[PDB]
Design a protein around this ligand. Structure first.
Ligand SMILES: Nc1ncnc2c1ncn2[C@@H]1O[C@H](COP(=O)(O)O)[C@@H](O)[C@H]1O
Lengths: 122, 122
């Protein structure tokens, strides 16, 4: 009985652009669940985080706007969305997903979710 | 009685050391006020921060455990203490020298303010 919003990212060096992404995400519902990329997932995207996955998760968990934070699953965003059951998934201004592709992918799993692109912080 | 705790720092790049300092400081009272160093002060103490003072302050304000955050005074700590009027001032575990120095200031003036060193972070 609440609108659950899922946001994602690496969150290596926290900065106000993150805060903008997370607050705009929280506004859309009641609960904000943040999925923090695994170090392996981050490397496979050509980033080696300065802070390890456990440290990045713990810091994100300390933010007022974050209700729950969990680690992602290496290789398997399908499973995260199945386990979180968001009503809404938010995409950062620069995140590399096509809203259409993501939607059809999620619909093939028999899940209905609203996908929203968040603005760049200025 | 609502105990006011004052913590201080630059908080340039947030990390779990900062979180342990802030979180343990909050545990000691009811309101945590964080005093964030101005860019001139940090520079003058030989630590150039990469994030500007307004950014650092704004990010610190987003932490669950922080009730209020303010910019410090350009080179005059006792002026901050006189304005914030904390019940407790929190220092890092390593800072016994700063502790003794602050204690002499307190004692000469005869104000009621308790200094507490926070436990060493792991
Ligand atoms: N400057 C910014 N403006 C808006 N959103 C941002 C900014 N910086 C990071 N984000 C978002 O925060 C999430 C995590 O970014 P990252 O830690 O770079 O993976 C992604 O959705 C980003 O688009």
């Amino acid at each position: 009985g609440m609108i659950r919003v899922m946001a994602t990212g690496v969150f290596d060096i926290l900065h106000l652009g993150h805060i903008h992404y997370l607050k705009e995400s929280k506004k859309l519902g009641d609960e904000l669940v943040v999925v923090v990329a695994r170090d392996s997932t981050a490397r496979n995207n050509g980033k080696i985080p300065i802070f390890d996955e456990n440290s990045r998760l713990a810091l994100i968990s300390e933010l007022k706007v974050v209700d729950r934070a969990i680690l992602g699953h290496e290789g398997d965003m399908m499973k995260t969305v199945i386990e979180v059951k968001p009503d809404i998934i938010t995409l950062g201004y620069d995140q590399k997903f096509d809203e259409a592709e993501l939607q059809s992918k999620i619909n093939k799993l028999g899940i209905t979710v609203k996908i929203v692109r968040i603005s760049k912080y200025d």
